[PDB]
Scaffold this active site. Structure first.
Site, mmCIF file in Angstrom:
data_model
loop_
_atom_site.group_PDB
_atom_site.id
_atom_site.type_symbol
_atom_site.label_atom_id
_atom_site.label_comp_id
_atom_site.label_asym_id
_atom_site.label_seq_id
_atom_site.Cartn_x
_atom_site.Cartn_y
_atom_site.Cartn_z
ATOM 1 N N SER A 176 2.184 10.975 28.722
ATOM 2 C CA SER A 176 1.615 11.243 30.046
ATOM 3 C C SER A 176 2.735 11.735 30.954
ATOM 4 O O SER A 176 3.368 12.750 30.616
ATOM 5 C CB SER A 176 0.872 9.992 30.507
ATOM 6 O OG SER A 176 -0.145 10.313 31.425
ATOM 7 N N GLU A 187 -9.385 12.237 26.391
ATOM 8 C CA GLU A 187 -8.327 12.111 27.392
ATOM 9 C C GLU A 187 -8.873 11.767 28.772
ATOM 10 O O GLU A 187 -8.187 11.101 29.556
ATOM 11 C CB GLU A 187 -7.502 13.403 27.457
ATOM 12 C CG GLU A 187 -6.594 13.630 26.245
ATOM 13 C CD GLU A 187 -5.365 12.717 26.249
ATOM 14 O OE1 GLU A 187 -5.104 12.084 27.296
ATOM 15 O OE2 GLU A 187 -4.669 12.614 25.208
ATOM 16 N N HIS A 206 -7.143 7.672 26.882
ATOM 17 C CA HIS A 206 -5.754 8.046 27.106
ATOM 18 C C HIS A 206 -4.863 6.812 27.083
ATOM 19 O O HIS A 206 -5.174 5.791 27.703
ATOM 20 C CB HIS A 206 -5.639 8.773 28.447
ATOM 21 C CG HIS A 206 -4.231 9.046 28.882
ATOM 22 N ND1 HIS A 206 -3.648 10.290 28.767
ATOM 23 C CD2 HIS A 206 -3.307 8.252 29.472
ATOM 24 C CE1 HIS A 206 -2.418 10.244 29.245
ATOM 25 N NE2 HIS A 206 -2.186 9.018 29.681
#
Ligand SMILES: *[C@@H]1O[C@H](CO[C@@H]2O[C@@H](C)[C@@H](O)[C@@H](O)[C@@H]2O)[C@@H](O[C@@H]2O[C@H](CO)[C@@H](O)[C@H](O)[C@H]2NC(C)=O)[C@H](O)[C@H]1NC(C)=O
Ligand SMILES: NC(=O)c1cc[n+](COC[n+]2ccccc2/C=N/O)cc1
Ligand SMILES: NC(=O)c1cc[n+](COC[n+]2ccccc2/C=N/O)cc1
Ligand SMILES: CC(=O)N[C@@H]1[C@@H](O)[C@H](O)[C@@H](CO)O[C@H]1O
Ligand SMILES: CCOP(=O)(O)N(C)C
Ligand SMILES: CCOP(=O)(O)N(C)C
Lengths: 531, 530
Positions: free
Chosen positions: B200, B326, B439
């Protein structure tokens, strides 16, 4: 004298002919004058009603084709020659045809009124594929068809002027509809049950009669085949039409200012000369764009067809709409790079991107790339076969399918019962290459029952298919429902979006007339062009 | 005492700790100071190298977490608390950690450096999911992770000013990276084989070190997991950075001169700064963060998009990838109609509202292009389809398509790229099933957390974790995750091949949402311009 072939209409007496069909005889009245010849001083003018006559007018053969361009792309080739004039070109062309059962019906019978297509620059009611004898014999219908002025002779407009008001080709059709109300009963026909059906520019014309109040009273149901009045090609603005009217005059030599002096000079020019320059008027070499089309003038059409479609109340109206499976392929052989009827037309990506601007002309560069985004498969961005089918979809969706879908949805939501089809049978006798699929216009011969002609070579199966399609159309004319009072044809609604497929197999129901693609054309792309 | 747990680095002596694993011990050196504490007058300033010390630094436990917001949305929920700080907050937080095999390697060993995520506003190297003991026991690499300043403390920028130049959290990471070059050999590491990997905002950090020459000579390979430096969220312009810094001063009672405003902010308790950082966002969004790296011509000479397209990336090997869903995680933090406790079956009005929340702009027509592409016009009102679609909108825009664009440009400009989609949902996942593989939930398998018997993973998941640690370490050693067995082919701009990572063997697929990403990477950008 055969009494069945003698009929008196409000203008005088007529003599017809008995046509032979496989099923039996039918009475034809071909070449009935419904307007004064629009010539000389009457060129570019609204039609004047036919002055009554003494004696008997022989309505025994198709009259002249209205002056128009003749397509020269593939000379002698059946696929193009079938649409070219099969009579002489003349400005004296305002004649209509009437088919009726033999003997004449005892009780009043419903009418079909055919309006041919041809991009508002061509077409004729005399074409073999419009032969009314099979439909009327098979379904005991009255069929009427009329000639209307095309090209500059029918749609040149100097808006505001009295000499070239525009839309006179539409007024030709309207006067023919007025003729049907005053006179069709004399042929055993019902003026309270009159169904317009037309194809391409004919379908667009049908829709404009739906949106023009003085025409609405003349019919009761509509059929729009592979065309719609809201297509990006069916109308022009006043400004655009005017710029095309004077540009034509300039290439012609007019003037050597006043609108009357401008058109008066145009009237001194021979008809061929206007036809030969007709074209060199368009702002861009394209496909699917036509120099002289109906004009949004505030008269025949009080607003744009979309504004009228959106604002209209359509309760009490029944509509049958549809397209062919491959609306697009026919037009690509006429100018898109890399295409021919005589090879596979496997185009490159560069040719696809170039073809997009020919098929979607007059749009911003941002608009063109939105078209490329939605029609490119980004896992196979350069596959020639996919690019060919994609370009065919582009100009097919933009020009025909998406406009028809938009029309069908607004009509269904606003009180009309709509019925939709996709015609997917490829005729055994088709002369076009296989990659073109089911091209534009090639369902017409099945609706008119042409496969029943013993001169032709259709399969026994195709003959049954035409008989089924003739029944659908006649059922709709009589009932406003193509269904037999057997798989059911469901009405088309804005939500379910149900339509049926027409081919040798029984009816199958499907959902969505290219719903994903047409969301781009009818919802997003307009908002891109405003901003 | 244990000589294996004593190491001397440039700054002085440290004492480590032996940690256990079901496969044997490893050595840890946790809480090594690599910078002077950036406190008081050092707040917002670039990190200064830690001055040498006498004595032995206790390196047996994790050090403090950098001051950050704490997520209070579902208190006590596992899926939430695993990312929350597990040590006390402090501005004294610039420490790193080293894990080596036990006993320390005698030969130079390849080094993995982990940069955590957390939107540039949170994160910590001390979190249980980042525990390096399993990776280094199973694969015998050296593992390093550092804390870097987040939020305003790391990325508040008054561009041009010297008192708050911005990007100091990125400089924290660079400084730790410099520390590795100088000192990793003392632990058995090989400074000539350093692989960055992050998730990320950490993945975006890795990418930014790729694009900044002073960082580039400090590592050799890169792994970007669910993030890119070219995300619409990872950077901010100089003007917007300046506006956000001044508004934050106003919100904390500081007026309103760059020097006077930074000086006043330096008087505020750190927790005051944290309480307001989220309120300087110009909109009511998901996936947008107040203080992020600033493009000012220094750390980044240009935008990451510009630097990617201009770059020569021959000799670079990169591993990139995303998880299957995601977007789903970010919708429970504010999209209308979403919750983790229901099926989030949203209406069209909510889906439309959720589009303006996911793609904070454009103001009028761009929103229309998104809803066009992501509506199924045969089923425009199906709630299940709209929930999934808004998840795709958020996930594509923010992660998948930035990843796909970086991968394609790097590949077509000389880099050898390997791409994956992580498609296994852990049996222990506490989030609802409609969120799929959210995610952040590939990390625990990469660090081999399933190997911990105290956790509740299956035998199949332990083998899966071992296969994943093998891929990552293979890549860190050779630039190729393939075992020197179905093969992981490199990702190219044309073929666009990637592999799915799950309990099934490697399956090769083409296209990282090629259709959706054409919209985001090709059309939309041009729309904004015109
Ligand atoms: C498919 O045909 C098109 C049309 O042109 C052909 O050329 C004639 C000589 C004849 O052979 C017919 O098949 C067609 O009319 C080809 O496009 C042409 O390509 C040439 C050279 O690139 C160019 O000079 C013409 O202007 C092109 N015409 C158009 C309308 O673009 C096309 O290359 C053919 N595709 C093949 C063979 O795969
Ligand atoms: N008036 C003209 O000169 C002119 C020339 C060409 N076209 C377009 O014709 C090509 N065409 C294009 C597509 C379909 C049919 C045809 C031909 N029909 O006759 C219209 C007017
Ligand atoms: N300073 C910020 O930009 C910012 C943005 C969002 N949030 C909180 O967003 C909730 N959230 C959303 C997604 C993932 C984690 C979390 C919570 N933080 O741990 C806090 C600060
Ligand atoms: C770390 C963790 O999740 N522990 C749980 C434990 O609390 C629970 O009792 C057990 C089933 O009884 O499953 C496991
Ligand atoms: C070619 C005839 O088809 P239609 O008239 N049209 C709109 C193109
Ligand atoms: C929030 C964790 O993921 P990453 O940090 N990203 C969202 C910026």
């Amino acid at each position: 004298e055969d009494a069945e072939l003698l009929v008196t209409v409000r203008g005088g007496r007529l003599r017809g002919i008995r046509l032979k069909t496989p099923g039996g005889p039918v009475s034809a009245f071909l070449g009935i004058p419904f307007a004064e010849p629009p010539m000389g001083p009457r060129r570019f003018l609204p039609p004047e009603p036919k002055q009554p006559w003494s004696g008997v007018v022989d309505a025994t053969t198709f009259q002249s084709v209205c002056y128009q361009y003749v397509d020269t792309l593939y000379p002698g080739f059946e696929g193009t020659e079938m649409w070219n004039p099969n009579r002489e070109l003349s400005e004296d062309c305002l004649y209509l045809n009437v088919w009726t059962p033999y003997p004449r019906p005892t009780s009043p019978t419903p009418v079909l009124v055919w309006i041919y297509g041809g991009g508002f620059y061509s077409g004729a009611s005399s074409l073999d594929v419009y032969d009314g004898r099979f439909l009327v014999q098979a379904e005991r219908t009255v069929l009427v068809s009329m000639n209307y002025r095309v090209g500059a002779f029918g749609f040149l407009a100097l808006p505001g002027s009295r000499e070239a008001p525009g839309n006179v080709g539409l007024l030709d059709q309207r006067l023919a509809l007025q003729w049907v109300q005053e006179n069709v009963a004399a042929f055993g026909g019902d003026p309270t049950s009159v169904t317009l059906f037309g194809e391409s520019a004919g379908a667009a014309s049908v829709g404009m009669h739906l949106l023009s109040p003085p025409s609405r009273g003349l019919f009761h149901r509509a059929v729009l085949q592979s065309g719609a009045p809201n297509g990006p090609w069916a109308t022009v603005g006043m400004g655009e039409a005017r710029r095309r009217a004077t540009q034509l005059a300039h290439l012609v030599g007019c003037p050597p200012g006043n609108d009357t002096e401008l058109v008066a000079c145009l009237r001194t020019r021979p008809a061929q000369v206007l036809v030969n320059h007709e074209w060199h008027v368009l702002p861009q070499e394209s496909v699917f764009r036509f120099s002289f089309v109906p004009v949004v003038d505030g008269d025949f059409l009080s607003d744009t067809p979309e504004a009228l479609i959106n604002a209209g109340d359509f309760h009490g109206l029944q509509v049958l709409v549809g397209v062919v499976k491959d609306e697009g392929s026919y037009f690509l052989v006429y100018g898109a790079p890399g295409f021919s009827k005589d090879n596979e037309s496997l185009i490159s990506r560069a040719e696809f991107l170039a073809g997009v601007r020919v098929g979607v002309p007059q749009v911003s560069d941002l608009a063109a790339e939105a078209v490329v985004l939605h029609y490119t498969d980004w896992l196979h961005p350069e596959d020639p076969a996919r690019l060919r089918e994609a370009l065919s979809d582009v100009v097919g969706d933009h020009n025909v399918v998406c406009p028809v879908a938009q029309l069908a949805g607004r009509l269904a939501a606003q009180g009309a019962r709509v019925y939709a089809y996709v015609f997917e049978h490829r005729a055994s006798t088709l002369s076009w290459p296989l990659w073109m699929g089911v091209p534009h216009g090639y369902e017409i011969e099945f609706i008119f029952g042409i496969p029943l002609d013993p001169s032709r070579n259709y399969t026994a199966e195709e003959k049954i298919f035409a008989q089924r399609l003739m029944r659908y159309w006649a059922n709709f004319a009589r009932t406003g429902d193509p269904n037999e009072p057997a798989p059911q044809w469901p009405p088309y609604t804005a939500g379910a979006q149900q339509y049926v497929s027409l081919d040798l197999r029984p009816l199958e129901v499907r959902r969505g007339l290219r719903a994903q693609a047409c969301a781009f054309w009818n919802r997003f792309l307009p908002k891109l062009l405003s901003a």
